[PDB]
Amino acid sequence: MHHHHHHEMEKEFEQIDKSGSWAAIYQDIRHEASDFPCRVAKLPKNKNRNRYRDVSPFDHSRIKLHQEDNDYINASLIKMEEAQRSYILTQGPLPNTCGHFWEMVWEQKSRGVVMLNRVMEKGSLKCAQYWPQKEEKEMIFEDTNLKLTLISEDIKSYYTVRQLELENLTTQETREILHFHYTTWPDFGVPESPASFLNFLFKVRESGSLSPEHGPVVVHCSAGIGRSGTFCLADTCLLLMDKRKDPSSVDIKKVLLEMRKFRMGLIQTADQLRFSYLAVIEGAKF
Numbered sequence: 001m002h003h004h005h006h007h008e009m010e011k012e013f014e015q016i017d018k019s020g021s022w023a024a025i026y027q028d029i030r031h032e033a034s035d036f037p038c039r040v041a042k043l044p045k046n047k048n049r050n051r052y053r054d055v056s057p058f059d060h061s062r063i064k065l066h067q068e069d070n071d072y073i074n075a076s077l078i079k080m081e082e083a084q085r086s087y088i089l090t091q092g093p094l095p096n097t098c099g100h101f102w103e104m105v106w107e108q109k110s111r112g113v114v115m116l117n118r119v120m121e122k123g124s125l126k127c128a129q130y131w132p133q134k135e136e137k138e139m140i141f142e143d144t145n146l147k148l149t150l151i152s153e154d155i156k157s158y159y160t161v162r163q164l165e166l167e168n169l170t171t172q173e174t175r176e177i178l179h180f181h182y183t184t185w186p187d188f189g190v191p192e193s194p195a196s197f198l199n200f201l202f203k204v205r206e207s208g209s210l211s212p213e214h215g216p217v218v219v220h221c222s223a224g225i226g227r228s229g230t231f232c233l234a235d236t237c238l239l240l241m242d243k244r245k246d247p248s249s250v251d252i253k254k255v256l257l258e259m260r261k262f263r264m265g266l267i268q269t270a271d272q273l274r275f276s277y278l279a280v281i282e283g284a285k286f
């Protein structure tokens with residue numbers, strides 16, 4: 001990546017931005033997004049496992065819990081072949097799906113969990129607090145046989161990082177889970193700034209939670225599509241820029257449409273699409 005690559009990327013962003021063209025681009029993405037069946041998500045027995053009736057994982061890419069009773073969880077596997085990275089996008093856990101959430105984390109061998117929403121948004125519970133606090137550092141999950149302990153918690157201006165210890169009560173095997181909570185990303189909004197977003201992303205990256213040596217990172221917001229989608233699109237585009245011989249050949253719309261083959265509605269506003277682009281060209285500098 002030489003200076004001309006940067007120049008063209010920054011110029012392109014500037015042309016789109018000054019002409020206010022993000023709305024048209026975002027509309028084409030929404031209009032062209034693929035649709036697949038979500039039959040399992042729609043079964044009556046799974047009604048209490050979905051936070052929103054309009055947000056469901058497609059059957060072909062949903063994550064299946066390894067349990068036999070009911071393997072359904074509103075979570076999707078996003079597999080980006082070229083970028084060589086897999087992400088699990090899921091909704092903010094409901095009070096009755098916190099066990100399933102950690103069951104999934106355990107089964108997929110994830111090392112990190114990325115949270116981009118807040119527990120209460122617009123006055124209601126958008127995500128159950130599925131992790132422990134200082135007063136009660138240990139949680140035991142109902143019918144999933146897992147125990148979770150808060151090892152450390154570092155609260156910063158725009159995000160918080162926690163080291164958690166996840167144990168399978170049956171086997172006594174324990175694993176370290178790193179929790180990355182971006183705490184200032186409003187629903188249907190954008191991060192505090194490209195810089196704080198990038199510092200966050202790089203912290204996740206530096207931890208090793210996104211490496212193929214570990215299972216897919218679990219990413220979630222409230223519905224698991226707008227913010228989670230923006231987060232993943234930026235990471236994937238930067239990966240493609242670092243891999244391709246010509247980093248300026250990355251087609252943001254095509255990449256997002258590809259990601260949308262795995263989960264509906266990734267990136268919920270034209271401003272989030274704009275932010276992803278901005279995050280990518282600013283991050284390309286590093």
Ligand SMILES: NC(=O)[C@H](Cc1ccc(C(F)(F)P(=O)(O)O)cc1)NC(=O)[C@H](Cc1ccccc1)NC(=O)Cc1ccc(C(F)(F)P(=O)(O)O)cc1
Nearest residue numbers: 051052053054055187188221222223224225226227228268
């Ligand atoms: N669209 C939205 O904003 C969110 C999803 C979302 C929330 C947050 C985000 C996000 F971008 F912020 P994130 O970054 O967290 O992905 C994306 C999507 N969806 C909703 O608000 C919808 C009603 C609705 C349906 C269609 C259109 C508008 C409203 N509400 C529900 O689905 C909740 C809901 C209400 C009622 C019922 C029911 F009548 F069937 P029941 O008989 O079981 O009482 C089931 C589910």
Ligand SMILES: CCCCCCCCO[C@@H]1O[C@H](CO)[C@@H](O)[C@H](O)[C@H]1O
Nearest residue numbers: 008009011012237248250252277280
């Ligand atoms: C998500 C990151 C996407 C980066 C896309 C970079 C696309 C660069 O594309 C180039 O931009 C130049 C400046 O306008 C144009 O003059 C060139 O014709 C165009 O090919």
